[PDB]
Amino acid sequence: MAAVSVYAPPVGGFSFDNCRRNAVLEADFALPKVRKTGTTIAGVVYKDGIVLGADTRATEGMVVADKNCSKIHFISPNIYCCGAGTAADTDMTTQLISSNLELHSLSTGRLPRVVTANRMLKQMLFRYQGYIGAALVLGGVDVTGPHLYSIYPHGSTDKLPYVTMGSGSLAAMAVFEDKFRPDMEEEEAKNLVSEAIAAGIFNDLGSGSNIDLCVISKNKLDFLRPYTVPNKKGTRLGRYRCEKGTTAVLTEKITPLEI
Amino acid sequence: SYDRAITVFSPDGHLFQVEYAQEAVKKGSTAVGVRGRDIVVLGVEKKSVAKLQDERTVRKICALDDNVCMAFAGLTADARIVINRARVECQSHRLTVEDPVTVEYITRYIASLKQRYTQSNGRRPFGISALIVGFDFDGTPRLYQTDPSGTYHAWKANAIGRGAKSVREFLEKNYTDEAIETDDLTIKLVIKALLEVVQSGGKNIELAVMRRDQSLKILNPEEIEKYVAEIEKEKEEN
Amino acid sequence: VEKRITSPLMEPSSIEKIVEIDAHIGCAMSGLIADAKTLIDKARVETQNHWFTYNETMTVESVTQAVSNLALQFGEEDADPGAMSRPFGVALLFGG
Amino acid sequence: MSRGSSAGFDRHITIFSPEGRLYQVEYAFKAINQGGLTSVAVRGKDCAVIVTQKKVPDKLLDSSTVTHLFKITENIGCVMTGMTADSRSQVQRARYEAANWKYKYGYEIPVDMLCKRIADISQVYTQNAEMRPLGCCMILIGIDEEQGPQVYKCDPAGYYCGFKATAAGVKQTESTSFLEKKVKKKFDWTFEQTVETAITCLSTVLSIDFKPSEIEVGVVTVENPKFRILTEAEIDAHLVALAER
Amino acid sequence: KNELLPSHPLELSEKNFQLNQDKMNFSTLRNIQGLFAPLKLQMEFKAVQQVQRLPFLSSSNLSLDVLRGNDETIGFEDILNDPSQSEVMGEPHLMVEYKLGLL
Amino acid sequence: MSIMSYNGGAVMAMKGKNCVAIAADRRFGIQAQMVTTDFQKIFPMGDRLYIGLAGLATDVQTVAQRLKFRLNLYELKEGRQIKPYTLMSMVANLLYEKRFGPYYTEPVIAGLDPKTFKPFICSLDLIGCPMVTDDFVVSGTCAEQMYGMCESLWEPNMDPDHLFETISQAMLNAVDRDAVSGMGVIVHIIEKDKITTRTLKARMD
Amino acid sequence: MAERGYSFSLTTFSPSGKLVQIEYALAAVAGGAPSVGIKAANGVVLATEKKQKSILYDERSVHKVEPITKHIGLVYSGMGPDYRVLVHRARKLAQQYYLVYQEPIPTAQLVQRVASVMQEYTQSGGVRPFGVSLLICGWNEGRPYLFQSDPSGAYFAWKATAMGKNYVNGKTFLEKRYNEDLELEDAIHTAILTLKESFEGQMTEDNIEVGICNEAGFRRLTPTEVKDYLAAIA
Amino acid sequence: SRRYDSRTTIFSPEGRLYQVEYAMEAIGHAGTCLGILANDGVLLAAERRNIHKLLDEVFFSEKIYKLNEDMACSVAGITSDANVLTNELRLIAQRYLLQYQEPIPCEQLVTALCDIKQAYTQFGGKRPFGVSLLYIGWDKHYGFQLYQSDPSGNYGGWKATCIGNNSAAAVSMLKQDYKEGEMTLKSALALAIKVLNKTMDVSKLSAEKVEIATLTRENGKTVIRVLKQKEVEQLIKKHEEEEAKAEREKK
Amino acid sequence: MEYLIGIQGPDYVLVASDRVAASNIVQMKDDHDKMFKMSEKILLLCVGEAGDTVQFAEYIQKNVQLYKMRNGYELSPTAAANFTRRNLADCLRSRTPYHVNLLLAGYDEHEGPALYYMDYLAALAKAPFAAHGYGAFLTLSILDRYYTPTISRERAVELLRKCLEELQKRFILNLPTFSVRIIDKNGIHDLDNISFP
Amino acid sequence: RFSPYVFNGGTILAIAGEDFAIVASDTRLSEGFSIHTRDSPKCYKLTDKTVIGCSGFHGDCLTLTKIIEARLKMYKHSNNKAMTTGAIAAMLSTILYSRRFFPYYVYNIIGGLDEEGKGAVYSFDPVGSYQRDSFKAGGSASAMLQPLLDNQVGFKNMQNVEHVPLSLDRAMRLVKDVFISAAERDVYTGDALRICIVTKEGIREETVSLRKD
């Protein structure tokens, strides 16, 4: 147990009693970075439902950390979200809202509504005053029809036929403005989203790798993780296959493990 | 009724629940402690020599600090709680004041804790009587006795628990300055008192010895039996 | 006051019933000893606080008034901390 | 409880009976009966209707203020039977819960969820010792987007079931039997048909022919989802139609 | 002490998040409903919290959650750090006395 | 200077054929001054499961101890060995519990599935961002060098001994180009039959 | 030995050492609607009877068999509102476990947490024990699970059991009928027969509620499927 | 008495807490739980109690509970109170490990749980924990130990003790057939089997009515394993053979 | 500013520290002992920021003494080091950081001698020898040069003397007197103070 | 930004005597480069044997005076007697140190008769430290006023001089002269001079006009 003089019961919730260390360390000299994902996420509203798109590159600083990252997060069987900004923040936000929506659906016994998820997300983000960096594109097809939202970290949302988020969002949105039609077909919407994601990939340093797609409609949910693979590694010319004995060791400890 | 609530005063003016805690103390095994010149010794009569039991885990004499000891008679769990609190307070005092804890200070703290638990009717009083004995900063021997009510008194020699009255009469009859002068005399006095408490004696004797500038040490059954043999030989000589 | 010495072994000096509140104030107790101890501690703390705040000795009447204000909080303190659930069982004679 | 838990099995809400029954909940039901009125709610395929007898005791009493038909939100209305003050408190709590649901979830609360929340609060009441169950009964009506008309009655014990034809009050058993007989004979259940069924059920169980001022009728239809209180003239017209046929 | 000064501007807000939410709900009820609703909810919360495990044991607070409307809502508060897995537990009697207001 | 560079550190994990490997440096030092050449950055979180933490040494130790606390409680409650994915989730939750002031460490988890014996490697961010890649995961003050070596050397389906050779070469060449990392490298090769722990010879400069 | 004062209080132990209020809660459970749970090799079935007082009851309004998560369901005998509150708590606990560990909560752990809640409610003085026992079903690690959480908080893992009215007779019937390697779609018939033993009248699709759990997950049988099973077994 | 036994905090005129005594009676109502200390190791042999045919045993320990790597415990009393107490035991042990990075000594954990129970018995409005626990563990200070806890909050180190049903007879039998110092793990198992066979008068043990867990030290690591049903059957068969041989010799 | 030093031998741990307590440019105290007696076998060499040193050292000392009183046996040196690291880290993360540099030395009847290094960030590290303060820079090189795992007690004292002479030769601050103590299986023995008049 | 303190000027001065305690101050309330009002005495009488002068931030001065009056009433209610000058000084020191980290921007000088009938002057700093002196000047022109008080009342730097006891008329003339000089050289002083003479008979208030800006 603890050692002497513990009076208050444990306090559940976030633990912020750690920033004095940060201040002291910064004063001593000059903070490490976290994966910002360098994202390009886009979505459109076509005739039958919603098509979401994302890239699969996660960047820590200016070095590619993950070459295959799933940025289209599951919120409900009919609702999906795309994350941009701080990776962990978007992941935790989407997971928490997904669990809350699952509880809501279990209590109600009916499919959740996109407006409910949007309201929860924006309310929580506003509560945290934008300290949680969650650039989100929320899309789904509830009983009221397809809906697409763009939720900013500070807690502002907007319902639009097509939205883009992330550092490469401008290229994708330019592609949309150039080649957007009201009431598109499924194939046309998929092609438009793929072109937007590809433009963001090839024009933004932070974006790259593969293309993710998620087709949401009142009939089916089509999650396409390896939808396209524009960029790939080149063939290795020389072989640097290290042979046994190349590396010199000092100590040997073989520990058998029982099966 | 008047005897059920701790806070309720009886028409005569008694807090009968405190007296019932005192009765619970009386139900406990006898604990005897005397004071001598640069020698303080404690003794507790074991209720029964239960076989297949580790004697270390059921000891009645403990050391609150390197210069203070304590023996109890009553509910064992309450005694353990009070002992832990007293040790914590002793260390806190040694921290804040930097000086070794006086027997008066820790006795006052224990009495205050017991009285505070007697305050409210939600909390029941600690059903233990403690014999806090030790040396002060200057090395003056000190013996004290607390009660569940929260009243502490200094004693030259005291006995608590079952058969406390008879042992107290024994000590009063057989307390002399010569006995206090010799440490072996005080030890023999405690052995005789406890043997009066329990006829069997022998293995049932749980005696602890503390001397000037020396930490608490518990005499092994060998030494206790040696002292019992000395007492028996002295009695036979008469 | 009279010391009730149950047995000769008990130290007569240990049975303290007249104490020193301040250099110019004394108190004699009669009743429950521990309640007396609490009231005496309150009186001493009040006198020292008065000396600290006003750089003067506290009047005997003022000390008695403060101790009385402490000695009436049975079901009327209206304070979360554990107060005097039962009335104090000691009567004091603040002679100073 | 601050005062203290009662001794007898039926003297406290928390402690159980040897069978395991909670007598305080049953006494709350007896209080609902003590309310003195009877409320009948009928569910159709086009609208939901709630009918309760309005008894203005004294002429000095303002009949406008005497009403047991309260609206929780713009689309959900309720009729309360039992203690007046307890019914008002439950109405206020339901209004607050519906408003909070609308604020937090972005869409109007369903009737079933409203009664589920109310029944959860009622269960909390029946579990702890400090509080007591409310001596009143809540019957909620409203048109769901997909399920159509919905009627839910919402009791002190914490039972939130939904019904095709709800009854509550002194004559609950007889009204329930009459409504079961009517339901067994499946009619078209049109709006006026449901209103006639409710009014005639109440008249049959009370053995009295109501005038326009002796009852208050609240309706909610698929075409008009807003909770509407029938004007006394409309109630009189319905009564005249009943009398003619 | 310097501990009174928050280390993070958001720390003070989220540390009392439940208290602030209850205060806001009371303020809204009292603005709209009246004095009866906040007082009623305060008594209800006091009654439910009065009955629970002792401080050194983690309580469920099921009735409190139902009354506060959090019985079907999960936030970072519930998941990130578990009050059950305290990792720091004081003396039982000390914690009880602290809650009682004695210390 | 960066907080990670205050104590240095470099941890690498690689995947082979039915086997996984994890390696780390053994240097502990305040800024530029070295203190010990035996600091442990890899901690066992199960029989076929290890976690390697790189970054501030005190934060590394605190995270390892708290993770062991949670792991022991979890295994006692469930009565089964934890899965690598479950360990990753636990680490992510632990790190996100201190989101606004973070634990200055980027753990990497390498181990085999207790039931399927399937290799599993992952890396965590400052605030607990899961990242599972089949090739390799690196973390430390020499992330760029480790990335380059791993990309140039890693091959699919590596033989355990040659997987050890590859990871050892990558770690040695990465730390030899980093000032605040090195002074020996420890390599753990985890296989279903056994686990081999090896200490390499490296420049003590 | 009247022991009336001991029976009134919950925290007060009887001289013999029995918690009488817990026994009264168990009696309340025994007075509830019968519910039968059978753990077959292929899966586990939770069948109960929903005694509808009148035909004017909306079957879709309430459900005695409720899902906790995608793979865990439960049924109850006793007090309805207590069952609903416990269902909400179980769902919240399962979602908390999923968020923390990113893994579906094992059935055993959920049962332990629910039992801890029941113990917390039956320990402190001021409230009453939940007069309801939950028959919790699940499927973890390719294995069916069946648990019964009593009001006191003691949970037992059963292969087949019945609660509510005539639960002793139901348990005897299950002992006579239950088989070690019994599969699903036959344990359903066994549960239907047990309900028949415990049912007074004719059992229709709306008079009973059946929920099954298998590798796919927990699923409450639709009234049509219940009607086909009833026709098949009679 | 019908008085002084309501609030769990009323001292009787003789100074008795009747509620604690009633909790001990509840313990006596529980199943037989036995623990024997031997130089080679310490073991716990407990009656499974529930033997219903339809009952399933999905856990490896029906009533044995492993607290940490170096400790284990057994329960005889209220099941849910026992579950919460075991959870608290594990929490305290892991807290000690976190703070000191060393396994908690057995006495420390027993003292912590007994302090919790005594606190529950001290403050009114809380029902005392009606659970008695037997602890087996190994530490670096006193080696193998066996401890027994009570609802009151009092523990004690024993070499062979029993709690639950027929506790007095089991204790007497242990006193009769315990050799302090010369007791080995195999002889300890034989003695436990004899004590269980005599105490449980329903019938001869079938290895499903009892559950035996042995704690030993192998290669410097504490090994806590539950004896398999076949091993318990073999031990019961050996005990029956010994009894039959003794009866035949008696003539 | 304040110098600590510790050398661990096969069956002993030799530790020493300067006796200078200076405020501004004046040495207020020239016989300031920086060694805190954790127990009969453990010492805590603590230097750092004015009040943090004494407060933290005494807090940990009272905690160790409380453990001894409650349990009857002393904490192992490893356990004491881990407890100190835990408390230091908890305080550092909180709103009242303790800027104290620690050097824990102790002997265990089972594990043997043990020297533990700890910085103000609470990063524990067991080392055969270690030092704190600005003199550590000048002295760690000598320790590396002349340290042997099987170093005798007298040779350890000689190496300590070499380190102190280097401090006098090169270190700007004057540290005439150093308090030297050793921890054996028989307990903590105070050796003659090394002085440089 | 927001500055909780502003300097409103004002000069206070107290002179102690055998049977008198003069407490004098100016009536110039000036913030910035403007004059708020020409009638605002800085000396407030607490009891019949104590007068306190407050200079500096006007809001803090008003709040402190009100708090002192409330505490005097509380003391009278509790101890059933009027607080003595030394007791008032100690209480004021405690009050000032209570708000140590948000210090009162008030220069406090307490002047009045003690229990022996002798003039007692207590000088205070914003933090709270105080001591008993025979004469003191506070406020904006304290530095200007103090040297002449030392020269005349203290007879400092005066070789071969007669240490005549300070009479009342001489004290009044000295006060008038020093305040005239302050008005001449200090822009924060002028308008009028409120003189409160605390004697065993009571408190006498005298107003002397000073030259306006």
Residue D180 tokens, joined: 């079961």
Q: Helix/strand/coil (H, E, C) string of B77-134?
A: HHHHHHHHHHHHHHHHHHHHCCCCCCHHHHHHHHHHHHHHHHHCCCECCCCEEEEEEE
Residue I138 tokens, joined: 């000048």
Residue H132 tokens, joined: 């008695």
Question: At CA D94, angle to CA D89 and CA D96, rounded to 5?
Answer: 95
Q: Quickly tell me which residue has 């079903």 as its tokens.
A: G137
Residue I50's CB is within 10 A of a number of other CB atoms, namely 10
To one decimal place, what's the resolution in Å? 2.8
First to last CA, chain E: 19
| Domain definitions of chain A by residue range | 40-228
Asked if A8's CB is within 8 angstroms of E14's CB, the reply is: no
Q: Which strands form J192-199's sheet, in the order they lie side by side?
A: J135-139, J11-16, J20-26, J192-199, J202-209
Task: Report yes or no: E72 at the I interface, CB cutoff 8 Å.
Answer: no
Determine contact, residues G116/H91, Cβ cutoff 8 Å.
Answer: no
Task: State residue I132 phi and psi, 5-degree precision.
Answer: -130, 165
First to last CA, chain F: 21
- CA diameter of chain G: 54
Q: Residue type at G122? A: T
| Cα J145 from Cα J26, distance rounded (Å) | 13
Q: Residue type at C62? A: S
- CA diameter of chain I: 48
Determination approach: cryo-EM
| A39 noted as active-site residue | yes
Q: Helix/strand/coil (H, E, C) string of chain A?
A: CCCCCCCCCCCCCCCCCCHHHHHHHHHHCCCCCCCCCCCEEEEEECCCEEEEEEECCEEECCEEEECCCCCEEECCCCEEEEEEECHHHHHHHHHHHHHHHHHHHHHHCCCCCHHHHHHHHHHHHHHCCCCCCEEEEEEEEECCEEEEEEECCCCCCCECCEEEEECCHHHHHHHHHHCCCCCCCHHHHHHHHHHHHHHHHHHCCCCCCCEEEEEEECCCEEEEEEEECCCCCCCCCCCCCCCCCCCCEEEEEEEECCC
Orientation of helix D111-127 relative to helix A87-108, angle to 10°: 90
Q: What is the CA radius of gyration of chain B?
A: 18
Residue B237's CB is within 10 A of a number of other CB atoms, namely 6
**Closest approach of chain F CAs to the CA of G109, in angstroms?**
7
**Closest CB to F100 among E8, E81, E87:** E8
First to last CA, chain G: 50
Determine contact, residues H209/H48, Cβ cutoff 8 Å.
Answer: yes
What DSSP character marks residue B29?
P
For F26, which residue in chain I has the nearest alpha carbon?
A: I125
| Cα D175 from Cα D169, distance rounded (Å) | 9
Determine contact, residues F53/F81, Cβ cutoff 8 Å.
Answer: no
Fold topology of I1-196: Glutamine Phosphoribosylpyrophosphate, subunit 1, domain 1 (3.60.20)
Is the backbone of residue I26 left (phi > 0), alpha (psi -120 to 50) or beta?
beta
Show which subunits contact I, needing at least 3 CB pairs below 8 angstroms.
A, B, E, F, H
* Residue J173, H or E segment: helix J168-185
| Domain definitions of chain H by residue range | 1-248
| Cα D226 from Cα J129, distance rounded (Å) | 74
The bridge status of strand I100-108 relative to strand I112-118 is antiparallel
Task: Report yes or no: H95 at the A interface, CB cutoff 8 Å.
Answer: yes
Residue D215 tokens, joined: 């009852």
Task: State residue D82 phi and psi, 5-degree precision.
Answer: 130, -150
Task: Report yes or no: J98 at the C interface, CB cutoff 8 Å.
Answer: no
Asked if J79's CB is within 8 angstroms of C55's CB, the reply is: no
The bridge status of strand F185-191 relative to strand J50-56 is unpaired
* Mutation target among H95, H101, H104, H140 for the I interface, most CBs of I within 10 A: H101
**Positive or negative torsion for Cα G53, G56, G62, G65:** positive
User: Which is the catalytic residue, given A37, A39, A56, A94?
Assistant: A39
Residue J206 tokens, joined: 């005298």
| Cα J43 from Cα J22, distance rounded (Å) | 11
Number of domains present in the structure of chain J = 1
Task: State residue G161 phi and psi, 5-degree precision.
Answer: -160, 160
Q: Which strands form F42-44's sheet, in the order they lie side by side?
A: F42-44, F49-52, F108-112, F119-123
Residues F52-77: b if buried by 16+ CB within 10 A, e if exposed: bbbbbbbbbbbbbbbbbbbbbbbebe
Residue A245's CB is within 10 A of a number of other CB atoms, namely 9
Task: State residue F49 phi and psi, 5-degree precision.
Answer: -160, 125
| Cα A53 from Cα A215, distance rounded (Å) | 9
By the 10 Å C-beta count (0-12 exposed, 13-18 middle, 19+ buried), G11 is classed as buried
Task: Report yes or no: B92 at the E interface, CB cutoff 8 Å.
Answer: no
Closest CA to H239 of H201, H208, H199, H204: H204
Task: State residue J151 phi and psi, 5-degree precision.
Answer: -65, -45
**Closest approach of chain G CAs to the CA of H59, in angstroms?**
9
Closest CA to H121 of H29, H228, H16: H16
Determine contact, residues H207/H236, Cβ cutoff 8 Å.
Answer: yes
Closest CA to G46 of G225, G175, G188, G179: G188
Task: Report yes or no: C81 at the E interface, CB cutoff 8 Å.
Answer: yes
What DSSP character marks residue F74?
H
**Closest approach of chain A CAs to the CA of F188, in angstroms?**
10
Show which subunits contact J, needing at least 3 CB pairs below 8 angstroms.
C
Task: Report yes or no: A88 at the G interface, CB cutoff 8 Å.
Answer: no
| Cα A64 from Cα F203, distance rounded (Å) | 29
Task: Report yes or no: F81 at the H interface, CB cutoff 8 Å.
Answer: no
What DSSP character marks residue F203?
-
The string of DSSP letters for E1-32 reads -GGGS-SSHHHHHHHTHHHHHHHHHHHHHHHH
Residue G190 CA: distances (Å) to CA of G30, G224, H28:
21, 18, 39
For I131, which residue in chain F has the nearest alpha carbon?
A: F35
Residue G31 tokens, joined: 């007075």
| Domain definitions of chain B by residue range | 1-238
Whether chain J lies against chain D with 3 or more Cβ pairs closer than 8 A is: no
Residue C11's CB is within 10 A of a number of other CB atoms, namely 16
Whether chain D lies against chain B with 3 or more Cβ pairs closer than 8 A is: no
Residue D113 tokens, joined: 């969820």
Residue G57 CA: distances (Å) to CA of D59, D152, D160, G52, G153:
40, 10, 12, 7, 33
Residues 6+ apart with CB under 8 A from D164: D42, D43, D151, D183, G56, G57, G58
| Residue ranges in chain B assigned as alpha helix (H) | 16-27, 76-96, 103-119, 164-173, 177-181, 183-197, 221-237
Beta bridge partners of F121: F110
Which structural domain range is residue G118 located in?
A: 4-233
Residue B4 tokens, joined: 């059920």
**Closest approach of chain F CAs to the CA of G102, in angstroms?**
6
CB < 8 Å to F66, chain E: 87
Residue C28's CB is within 10 A of a number of other CB atoms, namely 14
| Cα A225 from Cα A193, distance rounded (Å) | 14
CA B36 to chain centre: 15
The hierarchical CATH code for the domain F2-205 is 3.60.20.10
What DSSP character marks residue G42?
S
| Cα A126 from Cα A122, distance rounded (Å) | 6
Fold topology of B1-238: Glutamine Phosphoribosylpyrophosphate, subunit 1, domain 1 (3.60.20)
* Mutation target among E46, E52, E67 for the G interface, most CBs of G within 10 A: E52
CA H21 to chain centre: 19
Task: Report yes or no: H112 at the A interface, CB cutoff 8 Å.
Answer: yes
Closest CA to G69 of G31, G108, G98: G98
Asked if G153's CB is within 8 angstroms of H83's CB, the reply is: yes
CB < 8 Å to C82, chain E: 100-102
Q: Please report, for the domain that includes residue J197, its CATH number.
A: 3.60.20.10
CB < 8 Å to E100, chain C: 81-82
* Mutation target among G10, G11, G14 for the H interface, most CBs of H within 10 A: G11
**Positive or negative torsion for Cα E43, E45, E48, E49:** negative
| Cα B51 from Cα B30, distance rounded (Å) | 20
Show which subunits contact A, needing at least 3 CB pairs below 8 angstroms.
D, E, F, G, H, I
CB < 8 Å to B121, chain C: 85
Q: Quickly tell me which residue has 């639709």 as its tokens.
A: G222
Residue B93's CB is within 10 A of a number of other CB atoms, namely 19
The bridge status of strand B141-146 relative to strand B128-135 is antiparallel
Count contacts between F and I (CB, < 8 Å): 36
For G123, which residue in chain E has the nearest alpha carbon?
A: E53
Number of domains present in the structure of chain D = 1
Determine contact, residues G159/G146, Cβ cutoff 8 Å.
Answer: yes
Question: At CA G32, angle to CA G26 and CA G34, rounded to 5?
Answer: 110
In F100-119, the residues whose Cβ lies within 8 Å of chain I are 101
Residues 6+ apart with CB under 8 A from H123: B122, B123, E54, E96, H9
| Cα B62 from Cα I69, distance rounded (Å) | 9
Determine contact, residues D64/D209, Cβ cutoff 8 Å.
Answer: no
CB < 8 Å to E101, chain C: 79-82
Determine contact, residues I135/I155, Cβ cutoff 8 Å.
Answer: no
CA H237 to chain centre: 24
CB < 8 Å to D146, chain A: 110, 143
| Cα H15 from Cα H32, distance rounded (Å) | 30
Q: Residue type at J135? A: F
Number of domains present in the structure of chain G = 1
The class level of CATH for H1-248 reads alpha beta
Closest CA to H222 of H111, H61, H104, H110: H104
Which structural domain range is residue J77 located in?
A: 1-213
Cβ-based interface (< 8 Å): residues of H facing E: 84, 88, 91-92, 95, 98, 115-116, 118-120, 122-123, 126
For D145, which residue in chain A has the nearest alpha carbon?
A: A143
In CATH, which superfamily holds the domain spanning A40-228? Answer: Aminohydrolase, N-terminal nucleophile (Ntn) domain (3.60.20.10)
